[PDB]
Write a protein that binds this ligand. Structure first.
Ligand code: QU7
Lengths: 12, 236
């Protein structure tokens, strides 16, 4: 789940 | 009085007008884009509405006490286990606060007549929505309030049914302390309803059951070609 990881990691 | 732990949970609550305003605005530009002959099906727009609600749920969790101390892989496992439960609990509480007979209140701030939705939703969704409405009625009769709602949110998020966690002790501890704070809060603020704590806790397996059956139905609709973040959560 790259999208979920991105939403948890993104800075903005 | 309010246990200090519940006050900390209440801090983490999102700005609900801005959350709802942002989702309302998103759905409007998507429809405004589409031409006469590419309208969204009613089910399709509800999926997009649920998709955008999920974005706000992830942002809520990521900034919440306790959750923000987990490593991201632990965070993913928790959200993959409870995302549909959180959507259903949010829907149910919205009806408890704002619901009127014969209508459903959406995360966009719109009120829609039940007869309109029930005409289009199909037998399975109508059954799950009626099961959820039975929970709304029970919770309203118990005077379900915002402090109890945020407790149930964290009890859903920090599920003891999630495996392979690096920090299962934190999930176990949050589950225990939120349970203890809810037991204390109901005793202090609703001393005459002995049944309230237990009635609240017993809605959690019911919400879980509605949520998982909802996931299974949505997976069916996706495999059928009828349906973003929503699809990603279904696959994982
Ligand atoms: C029918 C729904 C739905 C349709 C497609 C995809 C997701 C939801 C609603 C009902 C109307 C709201 O506009 C949706 C929103 C919503 C909450 C999220 C459910 C998704 C969990 C997998 C609803 C709901 C309520 C009770 C039982 C079943 C569904």
């Amino acid at each position: 789940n790259a999208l979920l990881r991105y939403l948890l990691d993104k800075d903005d | 009085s309010i246990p200090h732990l519940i006050l900390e949970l209440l801090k983490c609550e999102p700005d609900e007008p801005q959350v709802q305003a942002k989702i309302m605005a998103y759905l409007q530009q998507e429809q405004a884009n589409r031409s006469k002959h590419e309208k969204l099906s009613t089910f399709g727009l509800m999926c997009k509405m649920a998709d955008q609600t999920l974005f706000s749920i992830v942002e809520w969790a990521r900034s919440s006490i306790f959750f923000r101390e987990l490593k991201v892989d632990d965070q993913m496992k928790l959200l993959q286990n409870c995302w549909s439960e959180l959507l259903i609990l949010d829907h149910i509480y919205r009806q408890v606060v704002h619901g009127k007979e014969g209508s459903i209140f959406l995360v966009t701030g719109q009120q829609v007549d039940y007869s309109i939705i029930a005409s289009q939703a199909g037998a399975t969704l109508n059954n799950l929505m009626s099961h959820a409405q039975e929970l709304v009625a029970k919770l309203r009769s118990l005077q379900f309030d915002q402090r109890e709602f945020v407790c149930l949110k964290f009890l859903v998020l920090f599920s003891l049914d999630v495996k392979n966690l690096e920090n299962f002790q934190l999930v176990e501890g949050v589950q225990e302390q939120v349970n203890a704070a809810l037991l204390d809060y109901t005793m202090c603020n609703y001393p005459q309803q002995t049944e309230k704590f237990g009635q609240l806790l017993l809605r959690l397996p019911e919400i879980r059951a509605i949520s998982m059956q909802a996931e299974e139905y949505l997976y069916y609709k996706h495999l059928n070609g009828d349906v973003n973040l929503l699809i990603e959560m279904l696959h994982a």
